[PDB]
């Protein structure tokens, strides 16, 4: 089975996670036929007849778009590998700014930059596309593995299923399931919203109930909830469940609903918006490009 | 030439009733809004609001029972907490806070709904069209 | 005539090398282009400063730990808070494990294919799958080094890729005694493999000299690295700079970096061209990571590493400028980091409970710096009274080796190419070998 991989506007994390299979990577490579992979081999061109493709990253520049279109024609099955390819990822945040702003900062206004001419690289480099777009927005995607990056075992499971001829199935529940933190039997109730530095969290109680914006509730399980287990809220790196299109919108809905529920009729509704100074960066960290409103006008 | 595209969300027991009251009484208002029925204002959440904007909405309206008159007792308190965050989130997304409007209209408040529809249209008409769909299709 | 090596392979990120010729058939222009940019420095604006260690790791999947800590240190300087000693040792233990994982990765999966098969035509052989067929032991040992390295990060950092424990005031979770014991038992096996890796490197670099490739892309330049009382240190210290003769030109606290470093811009690449502000674009060219760090260092912080370094100094001297000898240096650092993991685990403070410190009032400026596997990494953040990022600047390791890479590739073509026919598959690969020697993380470098 000829499998091929490539990367776009990502960080390479998904590929590193593929390598995080360790001993099993060799076992996997004896079952598949790796025909193209820029990080491991020198095969420059995407070959014809590719059964499965693992495309990492979203569409950040013009070359990314070409490659997506090229791999889509050469591959029978295309897989949006990771959160950046599936939902847009962290780079997506750049959608809050124009490309001109993004480029002027990196090549002009930076304190250590010395550009007297005031030029932006344009020779031999591709132009940036209007906004970071998930892979599904430019090409037909057959399957996807969510996670920033997806855990190794999950990547094996998906690839393994395709090799067997079966259809890959992703976990459907939200993170609280895997999460070991104790939940109140009466239900969730939030009193005050605290920033990650405000306070000393209790290691046993649910972080959302303690007043910290934990995205586990609006995030697909699979990762094993390492963030709350380590003492920090989930940032929603895996993205939403199959029944949720926009993760941030849903995360807010939930957060607002339970805020001051024990004083539901008389709690001030202006406490929450005044408390959260940066809303987009709190709920659309890894999914802004896949949101209904994925840019700032 | 250009006429705003507004979408409405109305609770079955109060605003949808108020909307019906305005119709019976022949209380004329602008033909921009297209109302969607829900049983409670609590059924409305950020996703439906953002979805509307993505689709091309120049305005989004949400109606419900007055605070304390919810047919379902406390559904509108949850929506009230949601809409306050949303208002500011829309600003962060470059969408004017004024393009989203939420009111509490009862089943018989047909005169209030008529006037709320007149005002909101005048506000969205002044603001001009929302260029989100224009930029996404690019 | 115009040839292009796109994409450059066995390097993190997108890059290409262009080789042009004039009408007479003579070598005209040889450039190194980086065709990717995401612009983190701008989108970080408006975000919460305490969230920087969540976004910056997403700059690169290989050295995410380095960005997590770098930001953490910066955030700790935004709020005037000094983290407890236990949190310093933990963060460091995390940083050392990541290096082991990084160095092992580059050397075995990205560099070794060329160092083992320098004169091969079969592209399907010049990779880890090809090495594993004739030498499975070499790849299994490499995998074990990474498995061990990432394990350390997963335990301390919380996640092997993109850790989340470095918070405001220190760490979110303390290392348990059971975890420490298991890690300490495994640490000895990591040191064994790192010693074996150096021996493998010796073998392979001899094969490189046997084909006269040890001098590819050679050029003399300054060198930068972090040192603590002159001793080699990747976590804390001051940034020392030595010239091509070895004399210490500078020594400063990372907070003053804007007075020593400057970044130039050329129209053919998204990667900038830095240099020593005072010396200038031509006189101020410098290099970072592996060798550069060994060059500026008086001695290594660990004993087993020091021995190999002393033997290396007697054989090549200080400062060494050979790009290909960055692979060797990388293996010395691989051992030193593996040794530091054991050293830090033995310290009883690592399992302490005083891991966090309440943050103080918000101070507008915040600079955090650490030596990432690929070079000096600086995270500089400016915020408002609430702690919202207003302006950011990132000087990421590999950007500091861009001029060296642009010059190096040019010197390879000058040595092997005289006409378009000379640019054969093996010759063109030599140019990528120069690039590879520096262990470039292109996504990292452009950010
Ligand atoms: N090591 C490393 Fe990064 Ni992928 C680079 N170059 C960071 O500082
Ligand atoms: S997804 Fe998370 S991990 Fe996979 S690439 Fe985009 S960022 Fe690096
Ligand atoms: S922490 Fe985030 S995830 Fe673990 S429980 Fe409380 S909410 Fe669900
Ligand atoms: S927890 Fe939230 S954040 Fe930490 S990994 Fe699982 S999903 Fe990504
Ligand atoms: S029923 Fe209309 S407000 Fe709940
Ligand atoms: Fe930069």
Q: Give the span between the Cα atoms of C276 and C263, in whole angstroms.
A: 9
State the residue for tokens 């470098």.
C445
Structure-derived torsion over alpha carbons of residues B13, B19, B22, B24, reported in degrees to the nearest 10: -70
Q: How far is CA A163 from CA A15, A34, A155, in A?
A: 19, 13, 13
Q: Which of C34, C211, C120 has its CA nearest to residue C429?
A: C120
The packing angle between helices A247-258 and B75-92, to 10°, is 130
Is the separation of the CB atoms in B88 and A279 below 8 Å?
Answer: yes
d(CA A268, CA A275): 12
Q: Which of A250, A103, A234 minimizes the C-alpha distance to A176? A: A234
Is the CB of A38 less than 8 angstroms away from the CB of C7? yes
- Choose among A149, A151, A146, A143: nearest CA to A168: A143
CB C156 within 8 A of CB C211: no
**Contacts of residue A235 in chain C, CB cutoff 8 Å?**
54, 164
In this structure, the residues whose C-beta lies within 6 A of any atom of ligand 5 are B 11, 13-14, 40-42, 64-65, 70-72, 75-76
Helix (H, G, I), strand (E, B) or coil at A6: strand
Three-state DSSP at B91 gives helix
- Does C51 reach chain A within 8 Å, measured CB to CB? yes
Quick one: CA dihedral A280, A283, A289, A294, positive or negative?
negative
Look at residue C206 and give its three-state secondary structure.
helix
Q: Are B5 and B32 in contact (CB under 8 A)?
A: yes
**At B48, phi and psi to the nearest 5?**
-70, -35
Counting one residue from chain A and one from chain B, the pairs whose CB atoms sit within 8 A come to 98
Tokens 């190794």 sit at which residue? A152
Q: What is the CA radius of gyration of chain C?
A: 21
Q: How was this structure determined?
A: X-ray
- CA-nearest of C221, C275, C239, C222 to C367 is C239
Give the integer Cα–Cα distance in Å for C378 and B58. 44
User: What is the CB neighbour count within 10 angstroms for residue A261?
Assistant: 17
CA A128 vs. chain centroid, Å, equals: 20
The Cα C212–Cα C197 span in angstroms is 22
Ion ligand 6, residues whose Cβ is below 5 A away:
C 394
Report the number of secondary-structure helices (H) and strands (E) in chain C. 15, 15
Q: Which of residues 21-80 of B touch A (CB under 8 A)?
A: 45-47, 49-51, 53-54, 67-68, 74, 77-78, 80
Distance, CA of A164 to chain centre: 27
- With vertex at residue C234, the alpha carbon angle to CA C232 and CA C239, rounded to the nearest 5 degrees, is 75
Neighbouring CB atoms inside 10 A of C74's CB total 24
Sheet with C261-264, strands from edge to edge, namely A113-114, C261-264, C273-276
Are the beta carbons of A63 and C35 separated by less than 8 Å? yes
A245: which chain B residues are within 8 Å (Cβ-Cβ)?
A: 47, 51
Domain interval for residue B66: 1-138
How far apart CA A127 and CA C35 sit, in angstroms, is 9
DSSP C233: -
Give the position of tokens 């026919």. C421
How many secondary structure helices (H) and strands (E) does chain B include?
A: 5, 4
Least distant ligand from the CA of C439? 1
- Ligand 3, residues A177, A180, A181: which to mutate, most atoms within 8 A of Cβ? A181
Neighbours of A (≥3 Cβ pairs closer than 8 A)?
B, C
Cβ-defined contact of B54 to A272 (cutoff 8 Å): no
Report the residue from A130, A250, A292 with minimal CB separation from B54.
A292
Q: Residue C157 belongs to what H/E stretch? A: helix C136-157
DSSP label at C34? E
Name the β-bridge partners of C371.
C376
User: Ligand 3 in contact with A218 (CB < 6 A)?
Assistant: no
Q: CA–CA separation, A263 vs A244, rounded Å?
A: 29
Q: Which residues of B59-88 are buried (b: 16+ CB within 10 A; e: fewer)?
A: bbbbbbbeeeebbeeebbbbbbbbbbbbbb
Any idea how long chain C is? 447
**Which helix or strand (DSSP H or E) is residue C134 part of?**
helix C128-134
The backbone region for A260, taken as left when phi is positive above 0, alpha when psi lies in -120 to 50, beta otherwise, is left
Chain A residues in contact with B95 (beta carbon < 8 A): 293, 297
**Pure H helices in C158-278:** 177-209
Element (H, E) at B23: helix B15-24
Of B46, B66, B52, nearest to B108 by C-alpha is B66
Chain-centre distance of CA C113, in angstroms? Answer: 20
Helix (H, G, I), strand (E, B) or coil at C212: coil
The candidate with the shortest Cα–Cα distance to C218, out of C410, C373, C28, is C410
List residues near ligand 2 (CB under 6 A). Answer: A 10-11, 13-14, 56-57, 82-84, 89-90, 148-149; C 58, 61
Q: What is the CA radius of gyration of chain A?
A: 21
b/e burial code for range A150-160 (CB count within 10 A of at least 16 → b): bbbebbbbbbe
Rounded Cα gap, residues C88 and C175, in angstroms: 13
Name chain B contacts of A252, Cβ cutoff 8 Å. 46, 82, 85-86, 89
- Under DSSP, the state recorded for C256 is G
Q: Which two tokens stand for residue C291?
A: 């060798």
Q: Residue C210 burial by CB count (10 A; 0-12/13-18/19+): exposed, middle or buried?
A: exposed
Alpha-carbon gap, residue A34 to A40, rounded angstroms: 10
H or E element at residue C156: helix C136-157
H helix runs in A165-231, sequence order: 226-230
> Ligand 1: which of C40, C376, C441, C446 to mutate, judged by most atoms within 8 Å of the beta carbon?
C441
Return d(Cα A225, Cα A229) in angstroms, integer.
6
- Cβ atoms of residues A222 and A170 within 8 Å: yes
Residues 6 or more apart in contact with residue A62 via CB below 8 angstroms: A126, A127, A128, A129
Please list, in sequence order, all residues whose beta carbon lies within 8 angstroms of the beta carbon of residue A1, skipping any fewer than 6 positions away.
Answer: A31, A32, A33, A51, A52, A162, A163
Where do runs of H (alpha helix) occur along C352-424? 402-416
Two structure tokens written together for C376 = 């000096």
How many Cβ atoms from other residues are within 10 Å of residue C394's Cβ?
Answer: 25
Residue B107: both structure tokens together: 């089943």
Considering only CB atoms, A44 lies closest to which of C7, C12, C79, namely: C7
Alpha carbon distance A182, A257 (integer Å) = 20
Q: How far is the CA of A211 from the centre of ligand 5 (A)?
A: 28
User: What gap in Å lies between CA B33 and CA C439, rounded to an integer?
Assistant: 60
**Interface subset of C 64-123, CB within 8 angstroms of A:** 64, 79, 105, 109-110, 123
- The DSSP code sequence of C334-362 is HHHHHHHHHHHHHSGGGG-S-------SB
C137 Cβ partners below 8 Å, 6+ apart? none
Tokens 């909830």, residue?
A225
SS3 A112: coil
> Class of the A2-164 domain?
alpha beta
Query: Can you tell me the distance from the alpha carbon of B118 to that of B100, in angstroms, rounded to the nearest whole number?
Result: 15
Cα–Cα dist C171/C216, whole Å: 44
The dihedral through the CA atoms of C167, C170, C172, C176 has a sign that is positive
CA dist., res. C419 & res. C3, Å (int): 12
Instruction: Give percent helix, percent strand, percent coil of chain B, each to the nearest 5.
Output: 50, 20, 35
Pocket of ligand 1 (CB under 6 A): C 12, 60, 62-63, 66, 102, 372-374, 377, 396-398, 441, 444-445
Rounded Cα distance, B130 and B32, in Å: 14
- CB A250, CB A240: distance < 8 Å: yes
Closest-CA residue to C435 (of C398, C409, C403, C399): C409
Interface touch A293/B95, C-beta < 8 Å:
yes
CB atoms within 10 A of CB C101: 29
Token pair 């109060």: residue: B14
Would you say A88 and A132 are in contact if contact means Cβ atoms under 8 Å apart? yes
Task: Tell the burial category of C176 from Cβ atoms under 10 Å away from its Cβ (0-12, 13-18, 19+).
Answer: exposed
Six token digits for residue A272: 């929450």
Q: How many other C-beta atoms can be found within 10 angstroms of the C-beta atom of residue C422?
A: 11
Instruction: Work out the number of other CB atoms within 10 angstroms of the CB of residue B8.
Output: 23
- Per the structure, the count of domains in chain B is 1
Q: What's the distance, CA C106 to chain centroid?
A: 10
What residue has token string 């010197």? C411
DSSP A53-99: EEEES-EEEHHHHHHHHHHHHHEEEEEEEHHHHHH--GGGGGGGS-H
Q: Is the dihedral of CA A140, A146, A152, A158 positive or negative?
A: negative
Residue nearest to atom 4 of ligand 4 (CA): A227
Q: Where are the alpha helices (H) located in chain A, listed in sequence order?
A: 13-19, 23-31, 62-74, 82-87, 99-104, 152-164, 226-230, 247-258, 271-275, 280-283
SS3 A264: coil
Closest partner residue to B84 among A257, A272, A293, by Cβ?
Answer: A272
Q: Contact at 8 Å (CB) between A260 and A271?
A: yes
Residue pair C312/C198 in contact (Cβ under 8 Å)? The answer is no
Give CA separation, C243 vs C179, C261, C328, C374, in Å: 44, 15, 21, 20
């Amino acid at each position: 089975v000829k499998i091929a991989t490539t990367w776009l506007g990502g960080c390479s994390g998904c590929h590193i996670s593929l390598l995080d299979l360790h001993e099993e990577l060799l076992n996997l490579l004896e079952n598949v036929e790796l025909v193209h992979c820029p990080v491991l081999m020198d095969v420059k061109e995407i070959p014809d007849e590719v059964e499965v493709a693992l495309i990492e990253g979203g569409i950040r520049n013009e070359e990314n778009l070409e490659i997506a279109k090229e791999m889509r024609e050469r591959a029978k099955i295309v897989i949006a590998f990771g959160t950046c390819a599936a939902f847009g990822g962290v780079p997506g945040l750049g959608n809050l700014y124009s490309n001109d702003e993004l480029l002027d900062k990196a090549y002009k206004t930076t304190i250590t930059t010395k550009n007297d001419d005031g030029i932006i690289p344009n020779e031999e480099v591709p132009e940036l596309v209007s906004r970071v777009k998930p892979l599904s927005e430019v090409i037909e995607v057959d399957y996807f593995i969510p996670g920033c990056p997806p855990n190794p075992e999950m990547i094996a499971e998906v690839v393994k299923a395709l090799l067997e001829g079966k259809e890959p199935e992703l976990p459907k529940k939200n993170l609280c399931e895997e999460c070991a933190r104790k939940k109140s039997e009466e239900g969730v109730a939030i009193e005050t919203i605290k920033r990650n530095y405000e306070g000393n969290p209790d290691p046993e109680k649910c972080l959302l109930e303690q007043g910290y914006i934990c995205l586990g509730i609006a995030t697909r399980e699979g990762c094993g909830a390492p963030c709350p287990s380590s003492g920090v809220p989930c940032s929603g790196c895996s993205g939403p469940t199959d029944a949720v299109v926009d993760q941030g919108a849903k995360m807010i809905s939930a957060l607002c609903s339970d805020f001051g529920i024990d004083n539901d009729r008389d709690v001030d509704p202006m406490i929450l918006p005044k408390s959260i100074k940066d809303k987009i960066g709190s709920f659309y960290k890894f999914t802004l490009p896949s949101a209904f409103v994925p840019i700032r006008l | 030439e250009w006429e705003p595209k507004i979408i409405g969300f109305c609770c079955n027991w109060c605003t949808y009733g108020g909307a019906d009251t305005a119709g019976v009484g022949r209380m004329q208002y602008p033909p921009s809004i297209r109302i969607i029925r829900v049983m409670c204002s609590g059924r409305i959440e950020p996703s439906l609001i953002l979805k509307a904007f993505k689709e091309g909405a120049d305005g989004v309206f949400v109606g419900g029972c007055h605070l304390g008159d919810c047919h379902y007792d406390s559904g509108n308190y949850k929506w009230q907490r949601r809409v306050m965050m949303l208002y500011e989130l829309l600003e962060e997304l470059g969408i004017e806070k004024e393009r989203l409007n939420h009111e509490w209209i009862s089943a018989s408040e047909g005169e209030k709904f008529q006037n709320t529809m007149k005002d909101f249209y005048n506000k969205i008409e002044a603001l001009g069209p929302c260029k989100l769909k224009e930029e996404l299709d690019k | 005539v115009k040839l292009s090596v796109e994409p450059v392979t066995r390097v993190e990120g997108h890059g290409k090398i262009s080789v042009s010729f004039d009408d007479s058939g003579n070598l005209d222009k040889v450039r190194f282009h980086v065709v990717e940019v995401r612009g983190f420095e701008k989108f970080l604006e408006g975000r919460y400063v305490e969230d920087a260690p969540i976004y910056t790791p997403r700059i690169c999947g290989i050295c995410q730990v380095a960005h997590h800590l770098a930001s953490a240190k910066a955030v700790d300087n935004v709020f005037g808070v000094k983290i407890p000693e236990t949190a310093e040792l933990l963060r460091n233990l995390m940083h050392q494990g990541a290096t082991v994982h990084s160095h092992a990765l580059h050397f075995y999966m990205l560099a070794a294919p060329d160092l083992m098969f320098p004169t091969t035509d079969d592209v399907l052989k010049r990779n880890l799958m090809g090495i594993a067929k004739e030498h499975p032991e070499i790849i299994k040992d490499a995998i074990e080094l990474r498995k061990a390295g990432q394990n350390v990060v997963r335990v301390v950092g919380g996640r092997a890729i993109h850790p989340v424990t470095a918070v405001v005031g220190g760490q979110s979770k303390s290392l348990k005694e059971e975890e420490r014991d298991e890690l300490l038992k495994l640490s000895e096996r990591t040191i064994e493999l790192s010693e074996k890796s150096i021996e493998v490197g010796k073998k392979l670099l001899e094969n490189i000299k046997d084909e006269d490739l040890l001098d590819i892309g050679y050029f003399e330049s300054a060198h930068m690295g972090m040192v603590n009382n002159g001793v080699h240190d990747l976590y804390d210290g001051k940034l020392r700079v030595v010239n091509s003769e070895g004399k210490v030109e500078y020594e400063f606290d990372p907070s003053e970096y804007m007075n020593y470093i400057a970044e130039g811009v050329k129209p053919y690449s998204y990667l900038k061209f830095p240099y020593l502000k005072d010396k200038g674009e031509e006189d101020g060219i410098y290099r970072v990571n592996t060798l550069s760090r060994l060059n500026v260092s008086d001695k290594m912080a660990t004993p087993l590493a020091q021995k190999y370094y002393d033997e290396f100094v007697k054989e090549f001297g200080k400062p060494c400028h050979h790009p290909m000898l960055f692979h060797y240096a990388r293996l010395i650092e691989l051992l030193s980091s593996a040794e530091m993991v054991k050293e830090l685990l033995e310290n009883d403070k690592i399992v302490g409970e005083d891991i966090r410190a309440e943050p103080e009032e918000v101070v507008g400026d915040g600079v955090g710096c650490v030596e990432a596997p690929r070079g000096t990494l600086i995270h500089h953040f400016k915020t408002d009274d609430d702690g919202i990022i207003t302006d950011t600047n990132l000087v990421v390791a590999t950007v500091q080796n861009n001029p060296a890479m642009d010059i190096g590739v040019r010197k390879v073509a000058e040595k092997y190419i005289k006409a378009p026919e000379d640019a054969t598959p093996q010759v063109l690969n030599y140019m990528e070998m120069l690039i590879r020697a520096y262990d470039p993380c292109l996504s990292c470098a452009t950010h």
